[PDB]
Design an enzyme around this catalytic site. Structure first.
Site, PDB file in Angstrom:
ATOM      1  N   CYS A 170       4.351   1.237   9.212  1.00 54.92           N
ATOM      2  CA  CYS A 170       4.219   0.110   8.303  1.00 54.92           C
ATOM      3  C   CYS A 170       5.567  -0.287   7.724  1.00 54.92           C
ATOM      4  CB  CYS A 170       3.243   0.461   7.198  1.00 54.92           C
ATOM      5  SG  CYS A 170       1.562   0.365   7.775  1.00 54.92           S
ATOM      6  N   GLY A 198       3.195   5.827   9.839  1.00 52.76           N
ATOM      7  CA  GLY A 198       4.559   5.661   9.393  1.00 52.76           C
ATOM      8  C   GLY A 198       5.253   4.418   9.903  1.00 52.76           C
ATOM      9  N   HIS A 202       0.803  -1.218   0.000  1.00 54.38           N
ATOM     10  CA  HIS A 202       0.000   0.000   0.000  1.00 54.38           C
ATOM     11  C   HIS A 202       0.840   1.274   0.000  1.00 54.38           C
ATOM     12  CE1 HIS A 202       0.196  -0.254   4.583  1.00 54.38           C
ATOM     13  NE2 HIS A 202       0.569   0.990   4.346  1.00 54.38           N
TER      14      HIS A 202
HETATM   15  C1  LIG Z   1       1.066   2.023   8.133  1.00 51.45           C
HETATM   16  O1  LIG Z   1       1.775   2.869   7.784  1.00 51.45           O
HETATM   17  C2  LIG Z   1      -0.227   2.368   8.788  1.00 51.45           C
HETATM   18  C3  LIG Z   1      -0.133   2.094  10.327  1.00 51.45           C
HETATM   19  C4  LIG Z   1      -1.365   2.402  11.111  1.00 51.45           C
HETATM   20  C5  LIG Z   1      -1.489   3.898  11.324  1.00 51.45           C
HETATM   21  C6  LIG Z   1      -1.924   4.068  12.596  1.00 51.45           C
HETATM   22  N1  LIG Z   1      -1.473   2.813  13.403  1.00 51.45           N
HETATM   23  C7  LIG Z   1      -1.164   1.825  12.551  1.00 51.45           C
HETATM   24  O2  LIG Z   1      -0.795   0.746  12.818  1.00 51.45           O
HETATM   25  N2  LIG Z   1      -1.236   1.529   8.178  1.00 51.45           N
HETATM   26  C8  LIG Z   1      -2.287   2.193   7.389  1.00 51.45           C
HETATM   27  O3  LIG Z   1      -2.278   3.379   7.292  1.00 51.45           O
HETATM   28  C9  LIG Z   1      -3.404   1.375   6.718  1.00 51.45           C
HETATM   29  C10 LIG Z   1      -3.241   1.465   5.169  1.00 51.45           C
HETATM   30  C11 LIG Z   1      -3.574   0.185   4.432  1.00 51.45           C
HETATM   31  C12 LIG Z   1      -4.501  -0.748   5.194  1.00 51.45           C
HETATM   32  C13 LIG Z   1      -4.075   0.467   2.998  1.00 51.45           C
HETATM   33  N3  LIG Z   1      -4.640   1.998   7.047  1.00 51.45           N
HETATM   34  C14 LIG Z   1      -5.118   1.916   8.436  1.00 51.45           C
HETATM   35  O4  LIG Z   1      -4.505   1.258   9.209  1.00 51.45           O
HETATM   36  C15 LIG Z   1      -6.449   2.549   8.817  1.00 51.45           C
HETATM   37  N4  LIG Z   1      -7.015   1.247   8.586  1.00 51.45           N
HETATM   38  C16 LIG Z   1      -8.211   0.415   8.700  1.00 51.45           C
HETATM   39  O5  LIG Z   1      -8.016  -0.672   8.286  1.00 51.45           O
HETATM   40  C17 LIG Z   1      -9.673   0.595   9.233  1.00 51.45           C
HETATM   41  C18 LIG Z   1     -10.410   1.713   9.546  1.00 51.45           C
HETATM   42  C19 LIG Z   1     -11.731   1.249   9.984  1.00 51.45           C
HETATM   43  C20 LIG Z   1     -12.908   1.896  10.431  1.00 51.45           C
HETATM   44  C21 LIG Z   1     -14.057   1.136  10.794  1.00 51.45           C
HETATM   45  C22 LIG Z   1     -14.027  -0.233  10.708  1.00 51.45           C
HETATM   46  C23 LIG Z   1     -12.876  -0.871  10.274  1.00 51.45           C
HETATM   47  C24 LIG Z   1     -11.707  -0.102   9.907  1.00 51.45           C
HETATM   48  N5  LIG Z   1     -10.443  -0.489   9.446  1.00 51.45           N
HETATM   49  C25 LIG Z   1      -6.316   3.046  10.284  1.00 51.45           C
HETATM   50  C26 LIG Z   1      -7.633   3.599  10.824  1.00 51.45           C
HETATM   51  C27 LIG Z   1      -5.182   4.050  10.471  1.00 51.45           C
END
Ligand SMILES: *C(=O)[C@H](C[C@@H]1CCNC1=O)NC(=O)[C@H](CC(C)C)NC(=O)[C@@H](NC(=O)c1cc2ccccc2[nH]1)C(C)C
Length: 306
Positions: A145, A143, A41
């Site tokens: 990931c 950041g 991603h």
């Molecule tokens: C990596 O860089 C980052 C790390 C997260 C940010 C905050 N803490 C972490 O571990 N990962 C991401 O940004 C993810 C991107 C890929 C999955 C494409 N996105 C997220 O982690 C968001 N992801 C969700 O999966 C999410 C939101 C949501 C709301 C309702 C129900 C389910 C659900 N899943 C996070 C909110 C930051």
């Protein structure tokens, strides 16, 4: 004496962490020989993330769409492919700090160390358990990931986890180093929830053996139990059923303490039924399930405080 959640020395892994930028998204990658591994991603914009087609997003990139920085040294990408939920970036330099390594997919209940990184720079180390529901209770910000989890056997680093996402309950999900998620999760900013979790019975038992090895027997009792009668108590308190395989695994710890596995199960059943009565076990007021039998043998002395 003492018992702490102990991570492996993170040195061999620190020398492998780099930064990967694509567009405006920056995250961490893992540089082994002439390849850098990172979550796919990284190629998403903010609006790509809600419903990405990575195959379509990726073919729109070239090698020079990817910026790889190793400390202050820029690394030139000379190839790229998608492996499940990871990108494999081939670079022009092979990492001189590459340790002996394997890629391993761990099983639920097993533990590993996490090296939390931001902008390719290590920032913290802590120990995690792969939960039964395939999440980990990590500590990750934006950041993070591409941070990896690992174990070290002798001189060999067994990479087993790369970080991808955070769930609504504040727990974390990710992949092995082949890009296959633990659990039913996908790398999309969709509605995704952790399944219900359970307590790792084999680990709680192993930690009671740790408590005895360190000289504490206050929770033991005169009873025993059948596997089946214990599992009715396990069900009531949301513990995983105990299997004969788990009993066999606890064999060596049972030998060092002289406490039969099903005798310890009777102790645990009593702890579950009666509570701990304001007392502690290895400094804890609750039953700890994030230490495997391997963790106990690794950390504890081989001689019981009799
Ligand atoms: C990596 O860089 C980052 C790390 C997260 C940010 C905050 N803490 C972490 O571990 N990962 C991401 O940004 C993810 C991107 C890929 C999955 C494409 N996105 C997220 O982690 C968001 N992801 C969700 O999966 C999410 C939101 C949501 C709301 C309702 C129900 C389910 C659900 N899943 C996070 C909110 C930051």
């Amino acid at each position: 004496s003492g018992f702490r959640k102990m991570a492996f020395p993170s040195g061999k892994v620190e020398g492998c962490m780099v930064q990967v930028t694509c567009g405006t998204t920056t995250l961490n990658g893992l540089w082994l020989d002439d390849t850098v591994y990172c979550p796919r991603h990284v190629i998403c914009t903010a609006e790509d993330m809600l419903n990405p087609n990575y195959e379509d997003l990726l073919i729109r990139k070239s090698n020079h769409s990817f910026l790889v920085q190793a400390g202050n040294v820029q690394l030139r990408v000379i190839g790229h492919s998608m492996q499940n939920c990871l990108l494999r970036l081939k670079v022009d330099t092979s990492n001189p700090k590459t340790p002996k390594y394997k890629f391993v997919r761990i099983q639920p209940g097993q533990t590993f160390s996490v090296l939390a990184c931001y902008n390719g720079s290590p920032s913290g180390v802590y120990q995690c358990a792969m939960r039964p529901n395939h999440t980990i209770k990590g500590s990750f910000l934006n950041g993070s990931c591409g941070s990896v989890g690992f174990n070290i056997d002798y001189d060999c680093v067994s990479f087993c986890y790369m970080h991808h996402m955070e769930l609504p309950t504040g727990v974390h999900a990710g992949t092995d180093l082949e890009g296959k998620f633990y659990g039913p999760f996908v790398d999309r900013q969709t509605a995704q929830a952790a399944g219900t979790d359970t307590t790792i019975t084999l680990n709680v038992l192993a930690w009671l053996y740790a408590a005895v090895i360190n000289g504490d027997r206050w929770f033991l009792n005169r009873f025993t139990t059948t596997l089946n009668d214990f599992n009715l108590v396990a069900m009531k308190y949301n513990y995983e059923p105990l299997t004969q395989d788990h009993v066999d695994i606890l064999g060596p710890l049972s030998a060092q303490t002289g406490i039969a596995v099903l005798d310890m199960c009777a102790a645990l059943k009593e702890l579950l039924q009666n509570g701990m009565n304001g007392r502690t076990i290895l400094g804890s007021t609750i039953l700890e399930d994030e230490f495997t039998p391997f963790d106990v043998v690794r950390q504890c002395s081989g001689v019981t405080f009799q």
